């Protein structure tokens, strides 16, 4: 009976992924450790590299971008926005807050402006950028929207970076996966990607980087990913990472009509009622994520209301302030973010929920 | 293929397996507010629990926090990072994971140890009453992890009181192999990790006193309530949970069990003439046998085991800073037990070792 329509928060194991962790669990995993066991553990992650690498439309060999495993995408955010604290550092207004609350912390950090569909100024951009006087710059721009799933021109945006000499990061964690990236073709140095979101489990995330760059470990001690990121590997949740990567990307079409079908399904059934914004409905978004405003509604508790219909979705917010949203309207949010394996039987549940939730 | 490097790492207990089975359809972040979101909460918690049972306090005096880290590592940095801007002091026999903020630390202080591996306390005392700042960390491993040997923490813990330092452990070799009550022992921090102790990888805790507040290297989302942020690794959470409660509930079975492997195994090795136990003569683990055997080469050696199809480890700035020679430093063998491990296991190791060192008992 429950309905899961929450895939932006996180997302089930593939079954695929859980078979083949399940094979590897009587295993001794230490990928440092000289022996068999170890050179075994070393080999299982070696693979995964590569299969990151070939998912993002890059090569290993040619040594031209490293991959760096961290825990968690949040943790590869604050890898590379540390790195930068010495430099001059800009963002969208509508980073996860593992960017974002990097306001708090860095020396010299700048918020590039978004419009009311939530796209990146990109004057405002370059009037940041030539206003800067370190050669050491970050710029930093989600690819895809958590909250609103809406998308930025990252090629276009590259231009700029590249025009001004300034290093180019973009968090792509709700990108991987369900639209297509050549990361290379993109113009990025830097990039973040994390494997729960895409069915690969918990605990397997990466950090992408540009081999002319040194990126300076934030955890130290044994020496792992070449002394920048310390601590025995996560050998499952990367091998995990790494098959859900190869079978997203090798599924992407198919999984990518799939979900745009129920979303479009979803979007006209909401818009039968009065009152629903569809938030980012005029420009591109990913094909998954739905993110409603109800004027005059509280978000808080017609979520209790869809959780006692046995339905999973959630809120946001300063993504929707920043895109001048009043407050009100802004805690009356809802977000509907779909996988592959929803279908059309969980589009209307939410539908049915829906009437009765705000009595329409 | 005979595992004998369970310091290293081990292997998934079945049980533990088992449960994280159980739960690898679900969705779970603890973060959302829905029916999935708050059973996942809920493992989380009850894993704090079992943590708190386990290092024998209970969590409703609210004397300590634990803080989820993705690994020991992690915590190590965590609580090292959070005195940087004082002054810290460290055995010279730490895991790398605190031995190398050497390099990083404004002002950090190296205290000895003898050769036996034991912390100098009067050394100890020397570098406490020189320091001038205030805020001052002893960071002491209770159980090390080449060669098993304790420290005398409660001891420690005076000491570190008598000058107002606060005092952290890495129990990581220590936890769910002898019993251990933080509070007891004195100590403000501690760290821990799950699949030292058949957890899984992707689980470990920093405990620290509620009455100190750790500053997050990790920012975000807010998880662990703004100290450590990211998405929880709740299934790793739940097996370390587990285990810890599982290794705390048998902790005397799987005492005595592994005892008797290593009494078996060095009585055996003491056969050999120029086989060296490292800190022999002073209180160890149950589990860790240490060796050197002067005028060979560990590297070379270990090649052997692996084509006898044996894991075991090499060691060495312990065992330098124990003052042993850098040739017979280059020499050490570390075999490590768990309470899976069998006669036959130690049988086997020592008939490959003797093909591979040229000896038969005398
Ligand atoms: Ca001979």
């Not at 010299?108 to 030539?130: F, P, R, W």
């Given at each position: 009976?429950?309905?899961?329509?929450?895939?932006?928060?996180?997302?089930?194991?593939?079954?695929?992924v859980?078979?083949?962790?399940i094979?590897?669990?009587?295993?001794?995993?230490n990928?440092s450790?000289?022996?068999?066991?170890?050179?075994?553990?070393?080999?299982?992650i070696e693979?995964?590299?590569?299969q990151i690498?070939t998912?993002?439309?890059i090569?290993?060999?040619?040594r031209?971008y490293?991959i760096?495993?961290t825990?968690?995408?949040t943790?590869?955010?604050?890898l590379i926005?540390k790195?930068?604290?010495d430099?001059d550092?800009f963002?969208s207004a509508i980073?996860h807050?593992?960017?974002?609350?990097?306001?708090?912390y860095?020396?010299?950090i700048?918020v590039i402006?978004?419009?009311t569909?939530?796209?990146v100024d990109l004057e405002?951009?370059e009037?940041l950028?030539?206003?800067?006087?370190?050669?050491k710059?970050?710029?930093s721009?989600?690819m895809?929207?958590?909250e609103?799933?809406?998308l930025?021109?990252?090629?276009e945006?590259?231009?700029?970076?590249?025009?001004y000499?300034a290093?180019?990061?973009?968090?792509?964690?709700?990108g991987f996966?369900r639209?297509?990236?050549?990361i290379?073709?993109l113009?990025?140095?830097f990039?973040?990607?994390?494997?729960?979101?895409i069915?690969?489990?918990?605990?397997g995330?990466?950090?992408?980087?540009?081999?002319?760059?040194?990126?300076?470990?934030?955890?130290?001690?044994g020496g792992?990913?070449?002394?920048?990121?310390?601590?025995?590997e996560?050998?499952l949740?990367i091998?995990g990472?790494?098959?859900?990567?190869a079978?997203?990307?090798d599924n992407?079409?198919?999984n990518?009509?799939?979900?745009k079908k129920l979303?479009?399904?979803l979007?006209k059934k909401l818009?039968?009622?009065p009152?629903?914004n569809?938030?980012?409905?005029?420009?591109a978004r990913?094909?998954?994520?739905?993110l409603?405003?109800?004027?005059?509604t509280?978000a808080?508790?017609?979520?209790i209301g869809?959780?006692?219909?046995?339905?999973?979705?959630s809120?946001g917010?300063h993504?929707?302030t920043?895109?001048?949203?009043?407050?009100?309207?802004?805690?009356?949010?809802?977000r509907?973010?779909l996988?592959h394996?929803?279908?059309?039987?969980d589009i209307?549940?939410?539908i049915?929920?829906?009437e009765?939730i705000?009595?329409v």
């Amino acid at each position: 009976h429950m309905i899961y329509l929450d895939h932006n928060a996180t997302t089930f194991i593939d079954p695929r992924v859980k078979e083949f962790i399940i094979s590897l669990m009587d295993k001794e995993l230490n990928p440092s450790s000289a022996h068999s066991s170890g050179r075994f553990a070393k080999n299982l992650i070696e693979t995964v590299r590569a299969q990151i690498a070939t998912a993002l439309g890059i090569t290993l060999s040619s040594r031209e971008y490293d991959i760096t495993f961290t825990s968690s995408g949040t943790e590869g955010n604050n890898l590379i926005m540390k790195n930068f604290y010495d430099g001059d550092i800009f963002i969208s207004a509508i980073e996860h807050l593992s960017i974002y609350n990097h306001i708090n912390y860095a020396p010299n950090i700048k918020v590039i402006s978004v419009n009311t569909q939530g796209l990146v100024d990109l004057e405002h951009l370059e009037e940041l950028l030539a206003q800067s006087n370190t050669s050491k710059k970050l710029v930093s721009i989600i690819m895809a929207n958590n909250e609103s799933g809406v998308l930025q021109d990252i090629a276009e945006i590259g231009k700029i970076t590249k025009k001004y000499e300034a290093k180019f990061h973009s968090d792509l964690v709700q990108g991987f996966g369900r639209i297509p990236i050549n990361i290379k073709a993109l113009g990025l140095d830097f990039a973040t990607i994390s494997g729960h979101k895409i069915g690969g489990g918990q605990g397997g995330a990466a950090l992408i980087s540009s081999s002319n760059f040194q990126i300076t470990p934030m955890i130290i001690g044994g020496g792992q990913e070449k002394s920048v990121r310390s601590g025995t590997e996560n050998v499952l949740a990367i091998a995990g990472f790494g098959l859900a990567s190869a079978l997203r990307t090798d599924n992407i079409s198919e999984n990518y009509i799939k979900i745009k079908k129920l979303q479009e399904n979803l979007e006209k059934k909401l818009k039968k009622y009065p009152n629903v914004n569809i938030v980012s409905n005029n420009v591109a978004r990913l094909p998954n994520t739905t993110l409603i405003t109800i004027p005059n509604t509280d978000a808080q508790a017609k979520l209790i209301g869809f959780d006692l219909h046995n339905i999973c979705v959630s809120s946001g917010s300063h993504v929707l302030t920043n895109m001048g949203v009043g407050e009100e309207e802004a805690k009356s949010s809802i977000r509907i973010s779909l996988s592959h394996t929803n279908t059309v039987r969980d589009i209307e549940a939410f539908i049915e929920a829906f009437e009765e939730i705000y009595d329409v």
